[model samples]
Target: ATIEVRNNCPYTVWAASTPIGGGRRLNRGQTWVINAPRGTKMARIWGRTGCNFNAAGRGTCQTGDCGGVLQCTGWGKPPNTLAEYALDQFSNLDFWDISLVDGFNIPMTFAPTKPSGGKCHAIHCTANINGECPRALKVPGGCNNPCTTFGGQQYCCTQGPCGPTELSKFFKKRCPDAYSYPQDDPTSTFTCPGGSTNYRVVFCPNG
Candidate 1:
């Protein structure tokens, strides 16, 4: 990742989520963080959740739709449209914080904890998530689904393949020195490969 992190859960350490660039719904352990020059501090940390699970992040055409755009502090509102007031939530925790609560008390935390013990990735299809969740819930019913809205309302659950937090923890625990990250979970991971330090057991893009 851009910040050179080891692990964030399972083993419990520090790691960086993929940076907020291209318009994409970034996951906890997925997405890529382009190397930021030292001392580069981000003024904002929230981002679009993707699209509504129904909209699927594509209200318009390709490249015209909201992709990996960064969002404000509103949990339900998205920066994509001005015609409609999107869903947003004000919380003590910001985008990257570990205490993000989705609809139906679905804890969308970054890492694991007692209040948020276990991982969303592994227990995604289980009771941790809504019973109808991850399988296209009835209309107007996904309103309270955690994956329904993240930092903003721009994202939906229909984008593509994305696992829960446990998936990330699974790999982090499975591989100690190495870390796992999805190339497209957010956008894509890019880096020059082939080197002793090019990340053998590390994530894609060699980061």
Candidate 2:
């Protein structure tokens, strides 16, 4: 499937994708397209803000920096809004979500380009989370997740049965369609027919 990442924010965005597509610098209204093959799992795309890379593609970003490199070879650092997806999975469905599990740096929408009007629905997290970010989770350019801010069994759910906490609630209240915590699977996950559908991941989609 083809995934198109678009930048609609007033500022520039350095888009990153792991295990595929690499990364790209996108000015407002620019786009980066990724061709992901079937059976691709554990893949993600995100945006980095306040970045300055040199000719060698080595620098830092205020948010979502991946080892201080331009083309990411691994997952990015926290405080990034994520578009996570796995194509051609169970029942030949593509599962995807707009996740704030790593916290949010930018507003985003993850949706199928061709909706079936049945189960395929667009999910967006367009809240001004940075503005209302809790003092504990506030960072220079983004809002950090509780798990990243204060790691513990309660917030990270690294062990036994776990559920949402007050910190997770803070994110959920604003972006119901996004994953607020690690255990936010049932509600946050969305699906569409695999192999045939294309996706559009937009940064600052509302703008």
Candidate 3:
């Protein structure tokens, strides 16, 4: 009296409702129990998280993986999304909050009639070598450089070509100390990371 999923496709079928801490893998004949709130629905299916920054897909990593901050999580997907948005349906209020699925997986599909109920008792991520390695740069410093230099190397918070020049001027006016000016190249004596170079942020109603 359960809905059985047959994997006729090539890729592994991940349960929409599973925990990220440790997901369940369904290769062949696998059985999972469905459990969730009576009015629960929707789910998220993900592959892998974080970056390795290498030509080979080995899990090994070198310097500059996290810029300077250690990795807190390994989610390597695009902008964060909810279960409902990932599957094309909507979830109840609790499902939207990341706290609900931060450490645990949430795999639950709705019954045709109910359309608002399901659970993920089994889940696992499908790992593939895709995604950029984490490279959060160090924050920018004051007009003076108080950063440590690697031998004769100096760090600067400027980008490339003419883009960095224009960007530096604009940001300098708004956030001078928080940012930097055009790079001096041969004389860049700063190795501090700048504030989030990215200036894009989307605010959802409940986000």
Candidate 4:
């Protein structure tokens, strides 16, 4: 399937995708197209803000920096809004979600493109999360996950089954369709017929 990442923010966003379409610098209104093959699991796309890279694609970003490089070889650092998907999964369905499990840097919308409709609906996390971030989770350019801010079994859910906390609720309240915590699978995950639809990831979508 093809996933188009569009930068709608007024400023530049260094878009990153792992194990598929590398990374690219996108100015306002620019777009990066990624053709991911079937059975692509655990793949993700996100926007990196406040970056400065040389022609060699080596630099750091204030948010969603993946090893200080342009073409991400791995998942990015925290405080990034994520568009996570696994194509051609069970029952030939494409499972996707907008995750704040790493926290949020920018507003986003993830959805199928035209000619695709049904139970599949667009998911958005377009609230001003950064501006309204709690003081404890506030960072320079983004909001930090409570698990990253205060590590524990409660927030991280590393030991066993767990549920949402006040911090996760803060995110969920604003973006109901997004994954606010690690165990947010029930309400956060969405699906569509695999290999039958294309997708779009829009940054700063509200504007």
Q: Highest TM-score: which candidate?
A: 2
lDDT of 3: 0.23
Identify the leading candidate in terms of lDDT. 2
TM-score of each: 0.24, 0.98, 0.22, 0.97
Candidate 3 per-residue lDDT over residues 68-169, each given as its tens digit: 112213332222211221121233222221211111111122222112223212211211101211122122210112111211122333343432333233
- Pick the winner on TM-score between candidates 1 and 2: 2
Q: How high a TM-score does candidate 2 get?
A: 0.98
Task: Report residue 33 deviation for candidate 4 (angstroms).
Answer: 0.7
Off by over 4 Å in 3: 1-6, 13-22, 28-31, 39-43, 46-207
Pairs of colliding residues, candidate 2: none
Candidate 1 global CA lDDT score: 0.23
Model 1: per-residue lDDT, tens digit, 1-207? 132222211211111122222233333344334333222222112223223323443332211123322322222222210100101133212111111222221112121111222111111111232233343321221223233333222223255554444333332233222212221122111112111111111111111
Ten residues in sequence with the least summed lDDT for candidate 3: 196-205
Candidate 4 whole-model C-alpha lDDT, 0 to 1: 0.91
Comparing 2 with 3 on lDDT, the higher-scoring candidate is: 2
**Cα deviation in Å at residue 5, candidate 2?**
0.4
- CA RMSD, predictions in order: 16.1, 0.9, 18.5, 1.2
Q: How would you encode candidate 4's per-residue C-alpha lDDT over 32-138 as one tens digit per residue?
A: 89898888999999999999899898989999999999999998988999999998655799889999989899899998985356558788888889999999999
Q: Sorted by lDDT, highest first, which candidate order results? A: 2, 4, 1, 3
Estimate the TM-score for candidate 1: 0.24
